[PDB]
Amino acid sequence: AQSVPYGVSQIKAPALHSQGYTGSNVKVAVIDSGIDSSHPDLKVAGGASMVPSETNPFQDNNSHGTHVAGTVAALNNSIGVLGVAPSASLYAVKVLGADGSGQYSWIINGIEWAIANNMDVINMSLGGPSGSAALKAAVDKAVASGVVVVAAAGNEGTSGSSSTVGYPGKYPSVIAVGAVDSSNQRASFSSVGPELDVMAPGVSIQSTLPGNKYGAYNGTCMASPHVAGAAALILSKHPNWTNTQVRSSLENTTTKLGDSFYYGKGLINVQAAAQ
Amino acid sequence: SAGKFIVIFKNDVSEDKIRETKDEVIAEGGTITNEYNMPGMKGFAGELTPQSLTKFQGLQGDLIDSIEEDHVAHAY
Ligand SMILES: [Ca+2]
């Protein structure tokens, strides 16, 4: 039997599914550790690997990318879980190796690939503490090219009044996603700062794992794909909307939570964002 | 090697100059591990010898828009 992870229901994705909006024909690039293309509950449309020692983007040697992918688009059927945009076209853009790390240069090449292959949405459930002019130029270019760019805010928790949002999430062109639990309470590890844009479920998120498995993971890296999937649902209903229109709607229809420093604009509500 | 870097060219730099620059990086003893060719964003990544690094830093605003160390990101 199929289970609907609480987070998918929390952002109100099922309401859109019942109306026929499931992310069909929307291309979402999961820039991560790859995606296990053989998972029964996932369909991968294509991809590319930027990791020198791991040239196969469809072999996720970490598990992270597959989990993120499942939150974005686990198939709607009679098994496993259900993604936010179950009909979205998933692309595995591998920029992180088995150990979960990757060079900014590889990530930039992944963003370039996404732009060249007309991705509609980019999800980057990854980050680093170091700023980068080239990385900023890359995400800015993707956004200028019309791509909705979403990234995890980071799991660095709080640090007084200082921002703990990592890169690329910290860049203005990127939608930085924080994590809340099923009670809409900010996860203790969720990064904070003025760069935080929206929140999504990021605690004990059940999704697909390599080798026909499923499991619950924690992280703003689990929250991010809820928003990337949300963008895909919105585009499946309004295919002509620019990324600016998609982002504006997502941020203007959130359910307001706590102070913006800790919750950004609040929890996304994709049903409302779909107008 | 001075380390791994990412170099982005100014947008008025010709294709021949871009090619010439990368060939030089290799000739000096460096490497080219990635190349970027997007409208409005051209550059490359690779290992640079010290002489290449300082040359690019000195050419900031002319041939180079930015030159930085190649950082690492993580899925956590
Ligand atoms: Ca399923």
Swiss-Prot record, chain A:
UniProt-listed Enzyme Commission number(s): 3.4.21.62
Any single biological process term in GO: proteolysis
Domain (Peptidase S8) ranges: 5-274
Record GO terms (molecular function): metal ion binding; serine-type endopeptidase activity
Effect of pH on activity: Optimum pH is 9.0.
Cofactor(s) it depends on: Ca(2+)
Main subcellular localisation: secreted
Co-factor remark: Binds 2 calcium ions per subunit.
Practical applications: Used as a detergent protease. Sold under the name Alcalase by Novozymes.
UniProt KW Hydrolase keyword: yes
An annotated GO cellular component: extracellular region
Domain of life of the native organism: Bacteria
Keywords: Calcium, Hydrolase, Metal-binding, Protease, Secreted, Serine protease, Signal, Sporulation, Zymogen
Reported temperature dependence: Optimum temperature is 48 degrees Celsius.
Transmembrane segments: none
Activity regulation statement: Completely inhibited by phenylmethylsulfony fluoride (PMSF) and partially inhibited by benzamidine hydrochloride, leupeptin, and pepstatin A.
Enzyme class per UniProt: hydrolase
Subunit structure and binding partners: Monomer.
Protein name, as recorded: Subtilisin BPN'
Organism: Bacillus amyloliquefaciens (Bacillus velezensis)
Record gene name: apr
Residues of the full protein shown: 108 to 382 of 382
UniProtKB/Swiss-Prot annotation, chain B:
The protein's name: Serine proteinase inhibitor IA-1
Family to which this protein belongs: Belongs to the protease inhibitor I9 family.
Modified residues (N-acetylserine): 1
GO biological process, alphabetically ordered: vacuole fusion, non-autophagic
Keyword Transmembrane helix: no
Primary role: Specifically inhibits an endogenous intracellular serine proteinase (proteinase A).
Gene Ontology MF term list: serine-type endopeptidase inhibitor activity
Signal peptide from the UniProt entry: none
Keyword annotations of the record: Acetylation, Protease inhibitor, Serine protease inhibitor
Record bears the keyword Acetylation: yes
